[PDB]
Structures are given as C-alpha cells and as structure tokens.
C-alpha cells in the first residue's frame, strides 16, 4: 500500500543538487535522483519548494511525504524521522574571499560574520561552536541569499556543504573571487553520515521502496550514469 502520489518537498535552492531553471522547472541530481526512484516505485511523485528548516516540521504535519534536499543523516534527526539508505556524502567546507587569512577556528572568526541555512547542520554546529563564543554567526532562509551577501560583503564567510559550495557558487561566474578557507570541518555528532530521503518513521513501506529502488538503479549503472552528468568525482563517497 505504497501512497499513490508522493509529494518530496525539497528547498529549490541549493545547486546541483535542487534548483529551478529560467522557466521554474525543478532540476539538479536530488530532482533526478528522485525521479529514477519514482518510476522504479511506479508511483507518481509531486516536488513541492519549501524553505529547508520547513520541511521536517512538514513531513511530520503530512503535508509532504519526503524530503530530498540534501538532508544530512545524522543521529539527532533520526529521532524524529527516518532515512533511506544513503544517496551520497556531504562534507561541510568553509568559503571567504580569494586570499583570505579564515581558517574555520574560533581565533580565526571572532568578530566576522558567518552565513548558515538556518535549520542545517550548520547552523547547529556553528551556534554551539562560534556564535556562543562571539562570532557573528547569521542564520539565512536559503543558501542564495548567502552567496549574495556574501559577494556583497556583508558576510565574511559562509559554512555549507562543501559540493553545493564548489559546484553553486565557486565555479559559476558569481563565486570567481572566492575560495574555500580551510580544510572540510568534520564533526561526526553534527554533520551526519552522507544524505538520505526522510520519512515518515511510521512510513516502513515507503522507505522500502526507496532503499530498494536506490539498490537496482545503483547496480544497473543508472546512479553513474546520472552523476557523470554533474561531477567528476565520486559523489557517492564509501
Ligand atoms: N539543503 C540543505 C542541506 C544542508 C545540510 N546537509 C543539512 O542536511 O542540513
């Protein structure tokens, strides 16, 4: 008994990975991901744009039924909802301007102002690591936002996961004066172990079709197929 629409909410504004194109259409790896499985599930699947700190509380009020958004695996959301397998790993990495003395320490970023999607991983992780102890940590509806006061300079810095940073912002004209500051910050207790769909706790069916889905368009070639069209690395990581 599978739903026989699946609405995924996901927050459009995080490229790759989700994004709208000039006519508003959903694209990015999550939006192909996504709909590979949808069509292996042989459900009908809806993408509703949501801000991200929005969508766990709209999963849980039913108003969607997943979520691909990059969503972070990590032990604290998973007492909430669940999680398919994982979809690929995200690393979080520091970005500032090209040049920049910032490394991601407490003695680098007192005083700065740092941007985080609030509701991420990010945001949790920089609130108890540098906003408790003086840095100016600003929390954004959306990651795009970030990138444009970021160029504007009223952000110094800006903390996400590192792929969306390279392949968002870094390598697009915007992001040509800027660079990664300092090595991915890791930290098993917040950042989670790569990104999976989120559910229901309670939808076992719909997490089974997910996993089951991701295991044969993995092995038919299908997830490879569809990753050479974004990246030139392995995504997927371990
Ligand atoms: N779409 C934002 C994703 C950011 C981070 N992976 C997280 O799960 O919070």
């Known amino acids: 008994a599978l739903p026989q629409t699946v609405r995924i909410g996901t927050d459009t504004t995080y490229a790759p990975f989700s994004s709208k194109d000039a006519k508003g259409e959903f694209i990015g790896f999550d939006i192909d991901l996504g709909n590979e499985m949808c069509k292996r599930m042989q459900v009908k699947c809806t993408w509703v744009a949501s801000d991200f700190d929005a969508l766990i509380p709209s999963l849980k009020?039913?108003?969607?039924?997943?979520?691909?958004?990059?969503?972070?695996?990590?032990?604290?959301?998973?007492?909430?909802?669940?999680?398919?397998?994982?979809?690929?790993?995200?690393?979080?990495?520091?970005?500032?301007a090209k040049g920049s003395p910032i490394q991601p320490t407490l003695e680098s970023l007192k005083g700065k102002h740092v941007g985080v999607l609030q509701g991420s991983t990010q945001e949790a992780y920089a609130?108890?690591?540098?906003?408790t102890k003086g840095v100016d940590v600003v929390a954004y509806a959306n990651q795009d936002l970030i990138y444009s006061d970021l160029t504007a300079g009223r952000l110094d810095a800006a903390?996400?996961?590192?792929?969306?940073?390279?392949?968002?912002?870094?390598?697009?004209?915007?992001?040509?004066?800027?660079?990664?500051?300092?090595?991915?910050?890791?930290?098993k207790k917040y950042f989670g172990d790569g990104t999976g769909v989120g559910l229901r706790k309670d939808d076992t069916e719909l997490k089974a079709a997910f996993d089951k889905a991701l295991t044969e368009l993995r092995q038919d070639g299908t997830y490879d197929k569809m990753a050479k069209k974004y990246f030139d690395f392995n995504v997927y990581g371990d």
Request: cysteine-free; charged content about 30%.
């Open 159 to 187: 903390l996400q996961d590192e792929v969306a940073a390279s392949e968002g912002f870094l390598k697009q004209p915007a992001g040509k004066e800027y660079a990664f500051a300092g090595p991915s910050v890791k930290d």
């Open 127 to 131: 609130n108890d690591n540098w906003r």
């Open 61 to 96: 009020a039913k108003k969607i039924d997943a979520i691909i958004s990059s969503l972070s695996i990590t032990d604290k959301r998973q007492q909430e909802i669940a999680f398919s397998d994982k979809l690929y790993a995200a690393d979080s990495r520091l970005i500032a």
